[PDB]
Amino acid sequence: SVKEFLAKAKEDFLKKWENPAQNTAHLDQFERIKTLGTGSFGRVMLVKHMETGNHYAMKILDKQKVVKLKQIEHTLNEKRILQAVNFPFLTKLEFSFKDNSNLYMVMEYAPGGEMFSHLRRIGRFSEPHARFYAAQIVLTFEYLHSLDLIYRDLKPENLMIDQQGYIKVTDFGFAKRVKGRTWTLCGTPEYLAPEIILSKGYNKAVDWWALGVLIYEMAAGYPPFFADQPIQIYEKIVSGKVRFPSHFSSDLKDLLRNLLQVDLTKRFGNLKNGVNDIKNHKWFATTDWIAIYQRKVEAPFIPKFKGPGDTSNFDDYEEEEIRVSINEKCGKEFSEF
Amino acid sequence: TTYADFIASGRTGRRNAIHD
Ligand SMILES: N[C@@H](c1ccccc1)c1ccc(-c2ncnc3[nH]cnc23)cc1
Numbered sequence: 222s223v224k225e226f227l228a229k230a231k232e233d234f235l236k237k238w239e240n241p242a243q244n245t246a247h248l249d250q251f252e253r254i255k256t257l258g259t260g261s262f263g264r265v266m267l268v269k270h271m272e273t274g275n276h277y278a279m280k281i282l283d284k285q286k287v288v289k290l291k292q293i294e295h296t297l298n299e300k301r302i303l304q305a306v307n308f309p310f311l312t313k314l315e316f317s318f319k320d321n322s323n324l325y326m327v328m329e330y331a332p333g334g335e336m337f338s339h340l341r342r343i344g345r346f347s348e349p350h351a352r353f354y355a356a357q358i359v360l361t362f363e364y365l366h367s368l369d370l371i372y373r374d375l376k377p378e379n380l381m382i383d384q385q386g387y388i389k390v391t392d393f394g395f396a397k398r399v400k401g402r403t404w405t406l407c408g409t410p411e412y413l414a415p416e417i418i419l420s421k422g423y424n425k426a427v428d429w430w431a432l433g434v435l436i437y438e439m440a441a442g443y444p445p446f447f448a449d450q451p452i453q454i455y456e457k458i459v460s461g462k463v464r465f466p467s468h469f470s471s472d473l474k475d476l477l478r479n480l481l482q483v484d485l486t487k488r489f490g491n492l493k494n495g496v497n498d499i500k501n502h503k504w505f506a507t508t509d510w511i512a513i514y515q516r517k518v519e520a521p522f523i524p525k526f527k528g529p530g531d532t533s534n535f536d537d538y539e540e541e542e543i544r545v546s547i548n549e550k551c552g553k554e555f556s557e558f
Numbered sequence: 559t560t561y562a563d564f565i566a567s568g569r570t571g572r573r574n575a576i577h578d
Contacts (some may be wrong), residue, residue: 261574291578292577337572341570374575378573394575395575405577406577407575408575410573410576411569442561443560443561447569449569466560469559469562502562
């Protein structure tokens with residue numbers, strides 16, 4: 222059963238949570254190939270592990286930049302959580318380490334690129350296409366939430382497509398293990414629940430709201446709340462009104478009304494029956510949840526492949542150096558990393 | 559159209575996280 226699987230998953234997780242792996246490789250064991258993404262919150266690089274020739278995605282954070290952004294605790298969260306999890310639609314840490322300058326997290330490489338890239342190019346996904354991805358998110362959240370983890374940054378930019386067309390939920394920079402309410406203003410404007418915008422204490426229900434935004438954007442091709450500036454976006458989100466495209470099915474509209482629900486007592490995922498309100502909704506009627514988890518379902522789209530370590534599904538970013546100071550930076554701040 | 563309005567907007571690229 223589901224409850225049995227999750228019980229065992231939690232036991233596996235907690236052992237790694239209470240005794241995190243630390244300093245399990247070194248930069249010089251990897252060959253840097255290409256920058257896969259970059260921004261103020263660090264970068265992800267394709268690297269080759271020398272001893273095996275395996276390819277990995279390596280997230281690199283500059284410790285000093287982390288400190289300036291006040292993301293020390295959040296970064297320790299990300300590493301501590303990712304080294305402890307194990308799930309078909311997550312990329313756990315294979316290795317992690319740090320040097321004088323940077324923090325490194327090495328995980329499975331997904332060569333199909335960001336969902337964001339394909340969604341924008343293709344324009345929108347068909348409902349069955351959207352549903353295939355949504356299913357994997359539903360299961361991943363069921364997993365994370367059962368471990369008391371809140372994810373807090375669902376978006377196409379943080380969803381990677383693997384060689385078989387399945388998804389990896391990446392970017393755990395705002396992920397937190399919390400049993401009660403929490404208060405941090407974080408996320409991405411288009412995906413923020415009303416609770417967050419209005420500076421209330423919130424819980425894992427914000428992830429289920431975020432799922433509503435994702436499913437909408439996947440099926441529509443644009444988000445349900447968009448504008449040129451974040452402030453105009455927040456006004457729309459709190460307003461309590463959403464418009465659906467005429468091509469949206471009845472079932473899709475109804476699922477979304479129940480996900481994009483300002484009222485926490487009625488928002489799907491949050492209620493007495495939990496995730497089963499979502500799993501048992503008419504829109505997911507054709508969804509074989511075990512087949513999704515088992516990866517037996519045929520993906521409606523598979524990315525173009527041309528070999529191992531191919532990067533054609535990713536954009537091109539300017540390659541910056543990986544600089545390592547001769548002096549140790551922020552040692553005490555990141556001692557547990 | 560809503561699509562036209564989205565595509566003409568300044569937020570069709572990769573969206574950054576926010577924070578305090
Ligand atoms: N969301 C991006 C990104 C942009 C700037 C900084 C950090 C992250 C992104 C996330 C993950 C990957 C990634 N690609 C491939 N394989 C992976 N495994 C784990 N993450 C990835 C690529 C870009």
